Structures are given as C-alpha cells and as structure tokens.
Design a protein around this ligand. Structure first.
Ligand SMILES: *[C@@H]1O[C@H](CO)[C@@H](O)[C@H](O)[C@H]1NC(C)=O
Ligand SMILES: *[C@@H]1O[C@H](CO)[C@@H](O)[C@H](O)[C@H]1NC(C)=O
Ligand SMILES: *[C@@H]1O[C@H](CO)[C@@H](O)[C@H](O)[C@H]1NC(C)=O
Ligand SMILES: *[C@@H]1O[C@H](CO)[C@@H](O)[C@H](O)[C@H]1NC(C)=O
Ligand SMILES: *[C@@H]1O[C@H](CO)[C@@H](O)[C@H](O)[C@H]1NC(C)=O
Ligand SMILES: *[C@@H]1O[C@H](CO)[C@@H](O)[C@H](O)[C@H]1NC(C)=O
Lengths: 246, 234, 246, 49, 49
C-alpha cells in the first residue's frame, strides 16, 4: 500500500502515519459495499440483460412454431395425415421457408450479441490484466479517482470488480508562487508546490498537504529571477550553513 | 403544382399517391395519409402503482381527436385524448403528465430533455432534466487549493463475460420425426450445416471468453492462514 | 539516420502543436412501424400478416434497443462529470487565449465559435428521407400536416440530449480542465493557476518546469497561432469532417 | 419483410460499429481530457499535454 | 568536443557535472566506453573553517 501510494504522487510517510485511519476507512467501505449489495438494489442489471435477452429470444424461437405461414395448419402431422405427397409438398415448403427464415434471424441476432459479449470480454480481460495485476496510471479506467488496487469477484455470466480508489477531501485555499528569487537566482520546487498562508512560505506535495521549510535539497536553481512571471522574493534556508562552524 | 393538361395523378418515390386531379372541376389536390400508430406510454411499475400517462408522438395537442378519431372510440380513450393535464413538447403531446417547473435527475426518459417520474396524492410528473449541481471555481492567478485529508472508497463495476451456450438441431426444429419432410429439407442444401457450425463457433467463443479472463495466472496461490495485514480485513 | 556508438541528437527548441481528431458518437434514432410499412391499413393484409407471427414486434424491439443504446452512448460519452463548472468572469490564464473554444454568452446557443463552424460544416443538403422528414418541421405554417406517418410509418425520434445541454457539458468540461486541471476528474475540484498546470504537464513528459517559466510568452504565442491555424483550417472549404458525413 | 429484415440487420451492424466508436471516444475523453496520458500516439501525435 | 555537460533527454539544458546530479556505482573498468573526466563537488569550493 505504501508503494501504491507512491504511484499516485503521495509520499509513503503519509500512509505509515495514518495506517490505522486507512484500515478503518477500508473496512467501513467494504461493509458499506456489503450492506448496499445485500439490499434490494438492482445494480446487477448488466448481467440481467444477458439472461433476459437469451430467455426472450429462446421463447420467441419456440413460439414461432405456432405460426402457419399461410399454410392450412401449423402442425406438420396434420398436413401429413390429411394430404397426399402429390399435393402436400405445396403446403410443406411454406412452413419450411417460414421456419428456416426464423432460424436465420435468430442465429444472426445471436452472432451480433456474441460480438457484443466479445467486446465486453476483451474489456474485462484488459481491466483484469491492468487493475488487478498492477497499478494503472490511466484516469477513470479502474474506477473513479486515483486507483490503488482492485479485487475481482465471480458472478453468473460475468465478473465483478471492486476498485479501491483514492479520493482527496477537505480542501484549503492557499497563496502560491511559481518560483522564489533569493539571491538574484530563481528557485523552483523539485516535486511539490510553493504555498503560503499569507505570513510564511512552505513547500508541500501536490496531492496532500504537508508543509516543509524551503531548502536546497527540495529545490533547484535555473537562471536569473527576472524572467519568471509572478516571482516572489523570499529567503532560502541552507541545511549546510549551521554545520560550517569549525 | 402546375399540372400540365392531361397529366392527372401523382406519386412519390414509394409509388404512393400524393397528388390527384378532380375529374369534374379539374382542380389539383395534395394527399397525406391519416392512420397513426405511434403511441408511447410512460408508466411506473405495477408492483409500485397503477397510474398511467400516455405520450402522443410527434403530433400536436390541438389535433389529437382528429388524427386518432377519438370520438368514435371508448370514453376511456376520449379522456386520454382530451383532459386537464395536456402538455405539448418537442417530442410530441403528453396527456396525463403533470408539468412542473422544477428539475431533477432523469428517471423515465422521453426525449428533447423531457423526463418523467413518480412524485407524491401520488401522480406522474413531467419536468425538464437537470444536468447537475451548479458549481463555480474561485479561480485566481496566485491562489491554489491543497487537500488536507482523504477518503478511501470502494466502487463496484460489473461486466458481462460469458453467454448461455445454446445448441439447435436444425433438422429437429424444422420438422420432427418426419422422413418425407426431411427428404424435402435436403433440397435446400447445407442450410442446417451452416447453422450448426455458426452456433458451435459461438459456444467455443464463449468458452474462450471465460478462459481468457479468469486464467490470467497459471498457479493457484493458497491464502495464508494468519490474517496479519495491518488491520485490513478481507 | 547518422547512427554511431557515441553520437546523440538533443533538440534545442520545441514547437507546440494542436491537432484535430473527429470520432462519431451516435446515429439517427429511427423507429419503423412494421404494420404501416407493410401495408396502408388493409385489414386483409393485417390478417395475412398475423399468420406470419411476431416479426414486427421483434423488429420494433430491436429498433427500440438500438435507440436506447444510442442514448446510452451519448450519455456515457458526455455526462462524465455531474458538477457543471462555470468559467471565471476574468480571464488572465497567463496570456493563453481560449476565446475560440470558450462558450459565447452573446448568443442564445452556448456553442463556441469553433463549435459553430462544426455545426455549419455538417449538413443534410442532399439527403433523402431525413431532409424530407425535417422539412415538415419547417412547414408548420400549414395546418393538418401529419408528417409522422406520411412516409409509410417511417419515423425519426429526437435525441434524448439536445445540442444546448451537450454544449453546456462541453463548456463545463473545458472550465474544469482550465481551472482545476486533472483534479476535478478524480474528485472535488481544486483551483490552481494555469502556469502550474502547464509546468506539471511539462514535468509529466520529462521536461523541467524552468523551460516553461523561461519561455511562457513564446509558448502562449505558439499556442495562439496554432489555435488560429486550426480555426482557419476548419473555416476553409476542406472536408475535414468526413467521418460524420459518412 | 425481406427488405425490412435486411434494413434492420444492416442497422444492427452499423449500431455495433457506432458502439465501438463511442466506446473509443469515451475512453479518449476519460484519458486525454480528464488527465495526461503517457501512451504514445493515443491523444494526438507526439508528447501529449 | 571541448567540455562535458549533462542535460535532460528532451531539451538542451547543459549543466556542470556534479555529485548531486550523478551517482557512483561500480568501478571504471567494467563499463564499456567510459570517459575520464573531473566532477565538481559543491561541498568544497571554499567551504572550509
Ligand atoms: C493577477 O491578476 C491581477 C488582476 O486581477 C493583477 O493585478 C495581478 O498583478 C496578477 N498577478 C500575477 C502574479 O500575474
Ligand atoms: C362538370 O360539370 C360541372 C357541373 O356543371 C361543371 O361545373 C364542370 O366544369 C364540368 N367539368 C367539365 C370538365 O366539363
Ligand atoms: C413490491 O411491492 C411490495 C409492497 O407492495 C414491496 O414490499 C416490494 O419490495 C416491491 N418489490 C420491488 C421489486 O420493488
Ligand atoms: C412555471 O413557469 C411559468 C413560466 O415559464 C409560469 O407561467 C408558471 O406559473 C410557473 N409555475 C409554477 C408552479 O411555478
Ligand atoms: C401546433 O400548434 C401550435 C399552436 O396552435 C402551432 O404554433 C404549431 O405550428 C403547431 N405545430 C404543427 C406541427 O402544426
Ligand atoms: C565505436 O565505433 C568506432 C568506429 O568503428 C570504433 O573505432 C570504436 O572502437 C567504437 N567504440 C567502442 C567502445 O567499441
């Protein structure tokens, strides 16, 4: 989980300092999923179309035998017991053409439905190979939000994915600058964002608030500070300078 | 239409008569059929309620009793062709729907942004859909927003994988246990062979779909006996 | 390629390029009255058709499923975010000009200039049944015009989502992309200066942010020139929208 | 009936193709619009921004 | 051809090769095609007491 937190730009020290909160949030989310699934919700309707369309098409195939297609009767034994083969064959082939055309229509619709399942199965295999077998940087593929891990579950005529995602909350406004000019040189953040509360300047990562003192370790210098639009003059702390006393 | 002199009737691309000439006064007419069969009904579930509203598709509310000839029908058809709750939209004419000015999430879609739902005194209401909650962003050239907390959430995604493997005997379905009918079936060729082959390929493809999804790994890993996952409960 | 074991090529400048990609979304929702298409209210024809069975109901069910699938495709391709973000009244996005893509409040339609060009480019000038059916809605001055079943029961259903709400959804997506970056897609929107978003998107492709903070004016000028070139190419007589025309 | 069946089958195939195109368009929306994609030549040509 | 520099793979930003932007792994004889050069140290330009 620390590595997967590192996959979305969050430093691993945040997870270790809030491991109990994450585990409590994860266990509550699983129980909320379990309670919502155990209710009378109809969220499994995607698998229900496959069952209902197959049942409707099978029932339509059976009920098509009741049609006579312009013949005397829809029963094959009725024609064979009332007519002779010198004049029964003019009545049989109407039932032959009608039933064969229904069989052509059913198989054609089954082939189109099989291609739709083929597209869904390829998408399901792609999601299984990406969300379950690893961490995906793709947006909104393994669920909404920053994806961390996924759990596949078996289902009748389908699969169910339990995407575990990362969602930030409790936003706070801050004042920011693109760079800091200290001694005529522009200092840029290495990974995070220069932020301020209006009184003091701090540097924190993008996806989480964790203020730090601006030093030379987390910043790099590139060129003068006269070409940067919106630069703010501020001091840069040196971690090496207090250790120079000898 | 300038009907040059003895050219009398007319037809469209589908050979149906659209223009004709009176044989007495030699005047020119236009023809537009009047049958109507495109009715739509918006109703909730029968286990929930029994109230029913009907949409008249692509016809004006001022021309409903003439197009459908409601006065020659039952009074129940008449009361659903003329009533107090009559509304006209882009999709057509709605009778029985209670039009409101509010906007909610769409429940029963109609068309052109019109959706219906069951609302409480229970009745079927009609309203324009709402795209979502109105939101604004306090943009600035020097202001940023950094989150201070986070929420771990679990989302459920359902995808179909397999399909019911059906198999049809073409000879049996066409006519059972009849040798004379089976003799006539051979005169049509290999139609039964094509259907048996096509359905066999579907069933193999369904087994391939289940194989290619659930067999990504080739080793069955047993779960550990202890559940020391740092507070995680699976 | 001048290949060797000790020679490398490093670019010294760059060019921001804007390209156009067109993908179809939905088709015309057509509903067919099978009984009306087969015959014009002939009771003998209806009695003869009833011998065939449930063909017309199956075709109507298939067409209704096609229309519902088209509406589902439009909803799943456009309603990605439920928060309808508004553009800020003051536009100072580091010199970047989005006036061609932002919605125009000077018109009742919320489409942009480029969206207006896209709407004016695709036309139904030489079409057949579709143009003839749409001309009945422009002939509303003449009463007793029952054009719904005039063409043997062939009807065209209006889309569930009209052009105004689709334009509103695209405007909300543009506002979320400009003001919040990629943070609004994962969760709640986070306001951020556009220079920060450009810097981090430059960092995402392995380019340090000091390049942007030193060449922001050149980047903005190149982006404006590319936007103008795209607008001029779309306003030309070239048939770049042939995919939807097909 | 044969003509109507032909039209319905062709419409079904065209609707399947439109479904594939719409799924591709929704994927392109969710990747390129809502974020930055590292996939080469998926959002335009070159390094995508 | 005269002096050595280090730059990123997508833009020409030549910099002085220091110990901060480099790291040490193994000896010189194993790497094929190594080039002898000096490395500046920002720890001791004059920082002595
Ligand atoms: C931000 O915009 C305001 C105008 O509302 C302007 O006065 C100010 O100088 C701008 N600041 C920067 C850093 O561009
Ligand atoms: C037919 O007779 C009527 C009645 O007099 C008259 O108005 C009409 O013009 C006649 N038509 C022709 C073609 O003679
Ligand atoms: C059907 O109605 C009953 C009450 O009449 C209710 O208890 C039940 O949950 C309903 N079923 C569904 C599927 O809504
Ligand atoms: C709804 O709005 C219309 C004007 O668009 C107005 O005439 C009518 O009174 C309103 N109805 C309600 C219930 O607010
Ligand atoms: C429907 O009626 C209204 C008012 O009577 C009229 O403005 C409109 O043009 C009519 N529509 C058609 C298609 O005739
Ligand atoms: C690089 O190629 C040149 C030209 O063939 C050759 O002289 C030199 O030895 C090669 N370098 C190495 C390290 O093999």
């Amino acid at each position: 989980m620390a590595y997967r937190f590192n996959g979305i730009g969050v430093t691993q020290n945040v997870l270790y300092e809030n491991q109990k909160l994450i585990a409590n949030q994860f266990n509550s989310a699983i129980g909320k999923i379990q309670d919502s699934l155990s209710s009378t919700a109809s969220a499994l309707g995607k698998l229900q179309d496959v069952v209902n369309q197959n049942a409707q098409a099978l029932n339509t195939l059976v009920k098509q035998l009741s049609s006579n297609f312009g013949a005397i009767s829809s029963v094959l034994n009725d024609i064979l017991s009332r007519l002779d083969p010198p004049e029964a064959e003019v009545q049989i082939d109407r039932l032959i053409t009608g039933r064969l055309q229904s069989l052509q229509t059913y198989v054609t619709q089954q082939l189109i439905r099989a291609a739709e399942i083929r597209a869904s199965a390829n998408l399901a295999a792609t999601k299984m190979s990406e969300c379950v077998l690893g961490q995906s940087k793709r947006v909104d593929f393994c669920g909404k939000g920053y994806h961390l891990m996924s759990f596949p579950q078996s289902a009748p005529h389908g699969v169910v994915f339990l995407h575990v995602t990362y969602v930030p909350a409790q936003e706070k406004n801050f004042t920011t600058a693109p760079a800091i000019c200290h001694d005529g040189k522009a200092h840029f953040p290495r990974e995070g964002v220069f932020v301020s509360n209006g009184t003091h300047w701090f540097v924190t990562q993008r996806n989480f608030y964790e203020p730090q003192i601006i030093t030379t370790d987390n910043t790099f210098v590139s060129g003068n500070c006269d070409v940067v639009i919106g630069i703010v003059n501020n001091t840069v702390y040196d971690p090496l300078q207090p250790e120079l006393d000898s | 239409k300038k009907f040059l002199p003895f050219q009398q009737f007319g037809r469209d691309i589908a050979d149906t008569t659209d223009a004709v000439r009176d044989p007495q006064t030699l005047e020119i007419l236009d023809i537009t059929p009047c049958s109507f069969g495109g009715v739509s009904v918006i109703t909730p579930g029968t286990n929930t309620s029994n109230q029913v509203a009907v949409l008249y598709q692509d016809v004006n509310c001022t021309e409903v009793p003439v197009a459908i000839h409601a006065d020659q029908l039952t009074p129940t058809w008449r009361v659903y062709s003329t009533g107090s709750n009559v509304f006209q939209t882009r999709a057509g004419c709605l009778i029985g729907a209670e039009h409101v000015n509010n906007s909610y999430e769409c429940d029963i879609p109609i068309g052109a942004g019109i959706c219906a739902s069951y609302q409480t005194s229970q009745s079927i209401i009609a309203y324009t859909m709402s795209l979502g909650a109105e939101n604004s962003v306090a943009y600035s050239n020097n202001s940023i927003a950094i989150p201070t907390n986070f929420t771990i959430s679990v989302t459920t995604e359902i995808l179909p994988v397999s399909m019911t493997k059906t198999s049809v005997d073409c000879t049996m379905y066409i006519c059972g246990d009849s040798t004379e009918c089976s003799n006539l079936l051979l005169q049509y060729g290999s139609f039964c062979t094509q259907l048996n082959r096509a359905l066999t390929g579907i069933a193999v493809e369904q087994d391939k779909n289940t194989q290619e999804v659930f067999a990504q790994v080739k080793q069955i890993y047993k779960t550990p006996p202890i559940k020391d996952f740092g507070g995680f409960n699976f | 390629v001048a290949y060797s074991n000790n020679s490398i090529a490093i670019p010294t400048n760059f060019t921001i390029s804007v390209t156009t990609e067109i993908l179809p979304v939905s088709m015309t929702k057509t509903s067919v009255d099978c009984t009306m298409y087969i015959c014009g209210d002939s009771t003998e024809c209806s009695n003869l058709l009833l011998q065939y069975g449930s063909f017309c109901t199956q075709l109507n069910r298939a067409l209704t499923g096609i229309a519902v699938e088209q509406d589902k495709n439009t909803q799943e391709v456009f309603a990605q975010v439920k928060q309808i973000y508004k553009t800020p009244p003051i536009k100072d996005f580091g010199g970047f000009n989005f006036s061609q893509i932002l919605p125009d409040p000077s018109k009742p339609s919320k489409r942009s200039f480029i969206e207006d060009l896209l709407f004016n480019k695709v036309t139904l000038a030489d079409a057949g049944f579709i143009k003839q059916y749409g001309d009945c809605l422009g002939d509303i001055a003449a009463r007793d015009l029952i054009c719904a079943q005039k063409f043997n029961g062939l009807t065209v259903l209006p889309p569930l989502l009209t052009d105004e709400m689709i334009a509103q959804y695209t405007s909300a997506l543009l506002a979320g992309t400009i003001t919040s970056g990629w943070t609004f897609g994962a969760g709640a929107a986070l306001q951020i200066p556009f220079a920060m978003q450009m810097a981090y998107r430059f960092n995402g492709i392995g380019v340090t942010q000091n390049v942007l903070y030193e060449n922001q004016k050149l980047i903005a000028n190149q982006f404006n020139s590319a936007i103008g070139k795209i607008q001029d190419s779309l306003s030309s007589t070239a048939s770049a929208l042939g995919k939807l025309q097909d």
